[PDB]
């Protein structure tokens, strides 16, 4: 006859939660923590108390040097992170090279704060003209030039040798920028130069550097034929910046004083600002997250989970849940 | 199932039981019921919890991507720093989907060891003073209230106690 | 043995069973013969062949080097670029012997889980029916005829319908 | 636990015992003592010295790190350089942490596998020829001296030279 | 007395496979499964329908620039991968440098398709003589050129300033090179050129450059002491590239169409051509396999298994094969 | 009643000893093996048999060029390692710049056996002088210069121009040094090399340099605004180095023959030597340990154990230890 029972036993729930195994897949479980994030706002939030430089459709040479088609940032100064597209089209309105560029915005994402300052007035130019101007670097279909650097053309039918010196006062670093001009031809060189035979030299503690333009014939860009390269350096505290020109100098009238370094990016994404706000930025939206991975793109800037190529993890943490 | 208890032996689990991940369920002249225990439960929360945290905590320092400009004539080292931080990628992710893959096997068999060990703490406590039917029940020799129960659940199961009524009703069916 | 029967109670295993991985051998008084377990044979057979195949793809991407040409000046960047070539190779040859040691352990105690899982399947449908010998052997204490054992096989073994019979003939060694 | 062994149904371990992992502690009219199973001991010493030995070689080659020297102007192959550095110290980082929490793990339980198998070789020897206590010991329904238990201890118990003895003895405890 | 007998038992065979575990190594097994792959046919094959470029004794410049040692190239124009020995023979036939070498190599791995056409005509040379020669770049013992470029000398006693433009009507990246000649002393520059203080200049939409002679006292290789400076650019569609010179130009008479880009490889190898066809190559033989590992060589192309420094990986599939 | 017994039991003892586990941590064990090396004697040991070059307070370039504040090791021959300071104190006295240093630095940790010799003995210069000079390049108080170049300057009022060779006898690669100097204006550089316009020119089988005076208008570096620029080769067996300059050449007095390639380093270390030695040396001291790893530093070098960041690695090899 049937007595007493005791039995033994284990939960199970109306659970559709899966987790994988390397034996087997798809095991029906009973509870399930998924670890990974893979969902973002699709935004350009700030980070923190900070609002990213959204360069829009000006470069980082662009905004620097002052194309005139980048003047909304004549006078950015703080910034978390910044957004520059793929493909901006407001670089160096007057075709040219910008030397150790990637070096430069490599400097930059180490750097959240700048300070514009007026360095070398146009009151200087005593006995030059510094009207140099090209249809290249318009603005309202009328001829104007980089905001930040100024040409320097014969005044009168003279052109001066130039000798000019800058001391850092500052406590912060100071990033200068100049350039040359390259003319077409010896004619050309006359009209704007008067001298035929030209240099331009900087010296720093550090730069000895010493340019001379190169004429020759080259295919049109932008109508022009003519080219500008531009050069940068940083000048330290207490040191000084000397330049020596006879021609072809595009001189600095602004520099930029390197107030706070901290980490940073440049990112490239097409996205415009988000007005919202963040602790984890990627170039293709912001994540909101505490799941200790996300698979939503590689490049991110903020306090983040870390990034796989998965589509799905997920750890069981319940049981086998038999049907 | 690795050890045999989970969807072997002890075939389905109880959607009754509620409190716990493992348990028992009664059956005497009193009345039924399921109850989990909780030692056993408790114990297996702490261990899958403290996983979780360990598995996160492993994974707290690993490769951080960051953007770098080439121009047109340094392909050499782009190609290579882009080489370099997908090696990165491919190897953090080859990681973590395998110590998930991995984990998530010992977790499974954790339970089904968890089960088997309470079915064993139990048979080895009762001995002969009742019969194992092979599902997971015990069917006892004696009388066991819902106070004796409570004994063997909680391990203070004194056998003596019931030694003697249960040999006589087990020798019964002889005789 | 991690679990016990391969190369355990279970001494030694039968080159006469062929037609799969785990099986039984009976013995009564119509004849003998091997007879493996398919149900426990094919889902060891679609266990392991999931792993290889997990193993694989998990490795599908993985680092692929690429020759890349360096001057006389750039030894620096060569130099990086060798190391860091290196450092994915000894990365995913670590990963690969590791996971192939790790997981060929785990399919050896799968065989013996799956082993000893047979036998407790067989053991508790028995119980008192048979004797357990210590070799992986049951002894009948009813009659078990070539029909009789297919059921135990399936698992579809009645036991009250030998249970009396039995009973006689356990106790008939006693008094 | 994970076989259910050591700090299981075996609550405790000796002090007393020294010569070896796992072994037994017998009492009968001659006299008690521990002694330990040297088969089962040296099984394990010899897996665990392989497994060290392996965790090892496994990691004779992994990534080396070198000084490489930039100037100002090289910021990008020079950060590229310490990110591809630190990558491969966090990554055989993590290799050897997790590598040396799981082998713990795998080492623990093989313990306690160790001592359910060494258990269960003395359990399928004695059968009914003795009562298992749930303790992990063994009460002899015969009589056991220091000689019938090194054939125990052995391996080489010879069953039927006790089982009438035996039977007589536990059929006693009845009628 | 004895009754009917059940056993569980397990399967066993004659089987010598052995597989490794963490804790004991050479467990001899039932079944395995090896997955690395160990052999290769020692061949340079066809990759899929597409042959290689087996360069021989030629380097990359030696076959661009058209050393006559490699004359066999002359009209190469579509491969799968190409083969190049460690330590060519035939590169720069006349002594000097590559500019940007290994950059155009690593573009060139990007390339299985060149057409090779004729850009400036030697007709055009109508006032300069373009039968400059060396023993150096010497043919059958018997002074020769670059095939693919010309070196422009004085005809009758003048060397007119050269200005010569090409402009890329097709829709294809065309690949032009030219060369500047560095002579020993001021004489010799006079019996070449004519013109004692030269330059040449290139440009053009990209492109801004000037190169001048270098004249100094340099070691004899192959009897030379002057020296002869490569330079390449990648002309864009609809742009032109504009040369001036008043000496030392060394002419491109042929430039490249870059017709198809696709994933290719410089192999460095000793091996001959192979004649037999693969779906993965390896540097030192092709590889015919299925595993999903290999432990042949790390420099791969083509649909491959995964490269491990192993020399052994099986996986045991079946149980312990006891004896 | 009572009969004999036998127990299944397990070893136990008074151990203190604790292993990790993922879903345990301080679990107290039987036995267990410590892997990871976590102390160091804190010593620049030697290695080996050999002794380092501790450059102390001088730099590779002060070393190599024989800064005045460098004298200890103009003879140095062999070593294991170098050991230099984060920022040394005495690099380039004089003002300037070194060439490739990275590159040479690097490829002076592939060299342990130097072997200084006399290349162009001062008794060459028979129609300069060779006593050029400076104050930042000054000795006791007292005006000096680079130990293992030499300052050519006018001698009476001329500056012949300069034409001299060197062969590599030797079997060895030979490291030649030389620089150019820059000086402050025309004034200047006719007081010193009479000379207006100048070049110093190199060349080799490979080499073929041009260098010219870059006068420009500098800040102020120990007092100077004048700068001077080193350069360096390795001057093949059986090879030529040729110079030709007609002023501001900083000429070659010693060359140093590289007779020994090893595995070597630069150690960045503050330390000084520590007389004792070693199989394994990190910068912040060095090893003595068979454990197969430990966590002191990543910089290593000699046969040791792998670095990891962990700072604890115990393997469990004995069982759970019961209270
Ligand atoms: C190569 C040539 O001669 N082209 C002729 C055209 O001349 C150029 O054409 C562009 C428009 O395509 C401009 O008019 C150029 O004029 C400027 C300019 O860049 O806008 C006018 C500037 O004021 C002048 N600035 C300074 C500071 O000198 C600038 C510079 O001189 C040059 O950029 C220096 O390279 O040039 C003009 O140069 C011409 O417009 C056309 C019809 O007249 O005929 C073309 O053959
Ligand atoms: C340095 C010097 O004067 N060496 C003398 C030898 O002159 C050179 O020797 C080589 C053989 O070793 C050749 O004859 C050189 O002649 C050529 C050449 O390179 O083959 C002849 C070419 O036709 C000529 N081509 C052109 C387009 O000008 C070529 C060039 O002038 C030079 O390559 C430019 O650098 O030179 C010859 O220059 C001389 O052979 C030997 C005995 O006469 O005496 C040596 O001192
Ligand atoms: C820029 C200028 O004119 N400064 C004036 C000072 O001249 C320089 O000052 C320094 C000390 O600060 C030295 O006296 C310089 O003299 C030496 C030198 O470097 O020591 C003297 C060397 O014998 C001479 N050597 C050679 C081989 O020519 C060396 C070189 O000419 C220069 O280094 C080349 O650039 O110069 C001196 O040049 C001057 O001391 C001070 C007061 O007289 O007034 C300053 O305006
Ligand atoms: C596992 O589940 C997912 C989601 O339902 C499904 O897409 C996939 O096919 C399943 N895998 C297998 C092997 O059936
Ligand atoms: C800057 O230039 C002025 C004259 O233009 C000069 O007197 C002064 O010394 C220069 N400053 C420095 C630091 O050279
Ligand atoms: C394992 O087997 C291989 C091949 O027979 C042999 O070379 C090796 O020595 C064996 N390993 C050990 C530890 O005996
Ligand atoms: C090419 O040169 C010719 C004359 O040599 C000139 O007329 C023509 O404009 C040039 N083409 C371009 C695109 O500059
Ligand atoms: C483990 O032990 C260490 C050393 O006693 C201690 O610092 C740490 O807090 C312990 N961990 C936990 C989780 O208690
Ligand atoms: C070295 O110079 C001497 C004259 O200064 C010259 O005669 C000799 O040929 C030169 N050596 C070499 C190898 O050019």
Known sequence: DPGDQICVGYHANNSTEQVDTIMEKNITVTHAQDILEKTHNGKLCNLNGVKPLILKDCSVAGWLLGNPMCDEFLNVSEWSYIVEKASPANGLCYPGDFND?????????????????????????????????????????????????????????????????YTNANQKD???????????????????????????????????????????????????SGRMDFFWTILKPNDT??????????????????????????????????????????????????????????????????????????????????? | ??????????????????????????????????????????????????????????????????????????????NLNKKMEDGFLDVWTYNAELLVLMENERTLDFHDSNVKNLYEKVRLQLRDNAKELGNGCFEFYHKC????????????????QYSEEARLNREEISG
Chains 1, 5, 6 share one sequence.
């Open chain 2, 145 to 160: 209230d819902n106070e004796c129960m409570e004994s063997v659940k909680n391990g203070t199961y004194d056998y003596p």
């Open chain 1, 174 to 224: 100071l990033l200068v920028l100049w350039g040359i001009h390259h003319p077409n031809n010896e004619a050309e060189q006359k009209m704007i130069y008067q001298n035929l035979n030209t240099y331009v030299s900087v010296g720093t503690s550090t730069l000895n550097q010493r340019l001379v333009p190169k004429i020759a014939t080259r295919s049109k860009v932008k109508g022009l």
């Open chain 2, 1 to 78: 199932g690795l050890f045999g208890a989970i969807a072997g032996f002890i075939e389905g689990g109880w959607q009754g039981m509620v409190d716990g991940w493992y348990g028992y369920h009664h059956s005497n002249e009193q009345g039924s019921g399921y109850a989990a225990d909780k030692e056993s439960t408790q114990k297996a929360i702490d261990g899958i919890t403290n996983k979780i945290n360990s598995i996160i905590d492993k994974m707290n320092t690993q490769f951080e991507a960051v953007g770098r400009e080439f121009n047109n004539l340094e392909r050499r080292i782009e």
């Open chain 1, 101 to 165: 560029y990637e070096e430069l915005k490599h400097l930059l994402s180490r750097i959240n704060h700048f300070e514009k300052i007026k360095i070398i007035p146009k009151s200087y130019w005593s006995n030059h003209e510094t009207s140099g101007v090209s249809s290249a670097c318009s603005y309202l279909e009328n001829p104007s030039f980089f905001r930040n650097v100024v040409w320097l053309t014969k005044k009168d039918n003279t052109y001066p040798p130039i000798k000019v010196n």
């Open chain 1, 241 to 323: 910046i000397n330049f020596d020109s006879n021609g072809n100098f595009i001189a600095p009238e602004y520099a930029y004083k390197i107030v706070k370094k901290g980490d940073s990016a440049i990112m490239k994404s097409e996205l415009e600002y988000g007005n919202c706000n963040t602790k984890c930025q990627t170039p293709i939206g912001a994540i909101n997250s505490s799941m200790p991975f996300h698979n939503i793109h590689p490049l991110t800037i903020g306090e983040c989970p870390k990034y796989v190529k998965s589509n799905r993890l997920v750890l069981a943490t319940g049981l086998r849940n038999a049907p």
